[PDB]
Amino acid sequence: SHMAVQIGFLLFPEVQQLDLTGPHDVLASLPDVQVHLIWKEPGPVVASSGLVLQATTSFADCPPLDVICIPGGTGVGALMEDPQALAFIRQQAARARYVTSVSTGSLVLGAAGLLQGKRATTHWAYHELLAPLGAIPVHERVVRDGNLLTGGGITAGIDFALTLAAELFDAATAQRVQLQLEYAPAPPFNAGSPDTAPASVVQQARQRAADSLHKRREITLRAAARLAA
Template structure:
């Protein structure tokens, strides 16, 4: 099984490395980190990660996964990346995302009519691409699978492995990574964190969220224009 995770500048590394850790433990799976070049890619918090293949050299993936992070904003209008995802999606068995990677899939026209989720702070933007927003930790709709924000990538990957290889395989991986969350606070969702902390975080994220909203609107216009051109 060929599994490809998109690696791009200013992504959130745990969006990528959480599901990578799960997929890499799936017997018989080859997991690739794919980008335009093989140069080191720096994540939003500074970590550098090496791609293992390029768009030009990548095999056809059975699973294509797009993580999120601030760098997702630039990808929304990156024709080379969107075209690569469309080509892969044409033959992939599973088309997937973590966090705001769902908005990149949306910009590529790959979520129209599908239930999907993403990070809580950008959840409503999914509808701009014809997706059906669902507030769940992970969502599987036919051959589309999406995880919520950051740490949800582990849950999403385990759920997907269960679909691909059975629950026993997924449970064995979960045990192997000792994924048994017991957070010190119940603040991992807006409902649990409470209004004051939500407002504080939204304020801190305001500039980035506005850039994301503008990018989503522009990408939705581009997608609509592409669809009109296809119908001519």
């Protein structure tokens, strides 16, 4: 309807698609919502897995959002130094009821200057990059600070989105969506956190992430300097 809650996700090359699509299917289940996928122009955008998503609007044509949500992914590094995207996020965040992100999307909120003195989380492997952007790093899966709501790494988007659903509507509605999603997880292993995975597996990861972390640190401190100026 013309009165729908306006929810917008940033959609960019090399997005981690589940950061977007988990929350999208949660939130699109809610009463009278309209969900936008926003980029430089409408059209196909390739996620880091090769899954092709489709932006529905340019930045300029996106209507004022009630909720803005930034997903993460490899593509976050470029986005953190994209003035067009950061300006859009700042404009929308000035008036949005909720300003939100999943996984390394919070590094983009940070680059936009929106985390200074704010509690936030991100993907576990990149968590040390929050503080140089002014954030107070919090090791929880969903972190709230006023109208800021950030989720942890990738699949945390589902927990984040159900939390947001309860704020937008009510607990009854969020629970109904949870039940419709049959979201009673039973993971076949206990390796979803660096605090519980086998040590051998954890060591595989930090090593797999190490080059990216150095590059993302470089980018983070440049983004921070632009804020500092």
